Write a protein that binds this ligand. Structure first.
Ligand SMILES: O=S([O-])[O-]
Ligand SMILES: O=S([O-])[O-]
Ligand SMILES: O=S([O-])[O-]
Ligand SMILES: O=S([O-])[O-]
Length: 337
């Protein structure tokens, strides 16, 4: 009674194909509960989940296509600019998902590509070193905290010159909030350590070598929290940037119909519910109940209007323009060094 909306013609064509090839940036052990639940709904589809770096998904999909090859049926990546680039250059199958009827216009590239998540950039901190009542929830507050000599060497954030997703998050921050400029000069004052990888930043927070990290995903934070009780999460109340992992179907899928079923599943309440609950990835669908959900995010930040979703839109391709990147990175490098 929670099966996704399904074209019966699409289900029947997927019975015949019997195969689904995914290229995904989402760790298989996060995706596993979705793949297993999907296989239980459509036990007649054999799935090949390829768990890849976001740059590799792009480089690989572009070669197989250009060499004329059988490539993925479905592409699922947190690299929003690369997905929106492919989907706006002839790589995407147009499909109107029946589970996406209430997606906002800024969560879908028309019928080319869909948001599957709404993941906040948050603050994480080590409760042994910073109590919750002293962790500020505004950029101005963080900039003040980072003047304190006890915080020198105790801050982590992204290196937006080595992490594509860190670029996207810090750039959205810089474009939307003037107080980001104050904060970035404070990263400089505090000698912030910059990380290309969430894992290496968290390791240092958990050890107490950093006390606080800025701009990492809520989904990852919650996942680490489940096993690490010293890990605190604070949500920004002056304004929160959110990432949307983007899914689209290969225009040239050998199994377009199996990809349609999987895409519909990912967007369905059943799939988004299971994602929130098992993977602790923050859902896109507003009707999901639990901690990793739009409703929970909106209450934590003090209202929906305090979340700026990075849109599933060609507008974000300005992030790939050399002069646009340059202005941000020159401000960034002057501020944090
Ligand atoms: O779930 S694994 O077998 O693709
Ligand atoms: O770029 S490495 O840190 O994933
Ligand atoms: O690439 S993420 O793990 O920082
Ligand atoms: O208190 S925990 O949500 O950081």
């Amino acid at each position: 009674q929670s099966r996704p909306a399904s074209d019966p013609q699409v289900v029947e064509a997927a019975r015949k194909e019997g195969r689904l090839i995914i290229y995904s940036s989402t760790d298989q052990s996060s995706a596993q509960a979705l793949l297993d639940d999907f296989r239980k709904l459509y036990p007649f589809i054999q799935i090949e989940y390829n768990d890849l770096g976001t740059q590799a998904i792009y480089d690989r999909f572009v070669s197989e296509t250009a060499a004329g090859a059988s490539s993925a049926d479905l592409l699922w990546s947190s690299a929003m600019e690369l997905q929106v680039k492919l989907a706006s250059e002839g790589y995407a199958l147009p499909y109107d998902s029946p589970e996406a009827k209430n997606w906002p216009a800024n969560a879908r590239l028309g019928n080319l590509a869909y948001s599957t998540t709404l993941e906040p950039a948050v603050v994480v901190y080590n409760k042994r070193f910073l109590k919750p009542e002293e962790v500020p929830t505004t950029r101005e507050g963080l900039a003040r905290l980072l003047q304190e000599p006890r915080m020198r060497g105790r801050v982590a954030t992204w290196d937006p010159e080595r992490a594509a997703v860190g670029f996207t998050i810090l750039k959205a921050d810089y474009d939307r909030f003037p107080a980001f400029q104050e904060l970035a000069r404070a990263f400089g004052k505090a000698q912030a350590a910059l990380y290309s990888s969430t894992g290496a930043a968290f390791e240092k927070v958990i050890s107490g070598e950093h006390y606080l990290a800025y701009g990492f995903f809520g989904s990852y934070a919650l996942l680490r929290q489940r096993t690490v009780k010293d890990l605190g999460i604070a949500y920004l109340t002056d304004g929160t940037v959110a990432i949307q992992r983007v899914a689209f179907i290969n225009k040239r899928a050998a199994h377009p119909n199996a990809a349609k079923l999987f895409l519909d599943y990912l967007l369905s309440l059943r799939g988004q519910n299971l994602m929130a609950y098992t993977a602790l990835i923050f859902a896109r669908r507003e009707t999901v109940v639990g901690e990793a959900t739009p409703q929970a995010l909106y209450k934590a930040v003090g209202g929906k209007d305090k979340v700026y979703a990075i849109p599933v839109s060609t507008e974000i391709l300005k992030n790939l323009d050399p002069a646009e990147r340059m202005r941000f990175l020159t401000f960034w490098r002057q501020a944090v060094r």
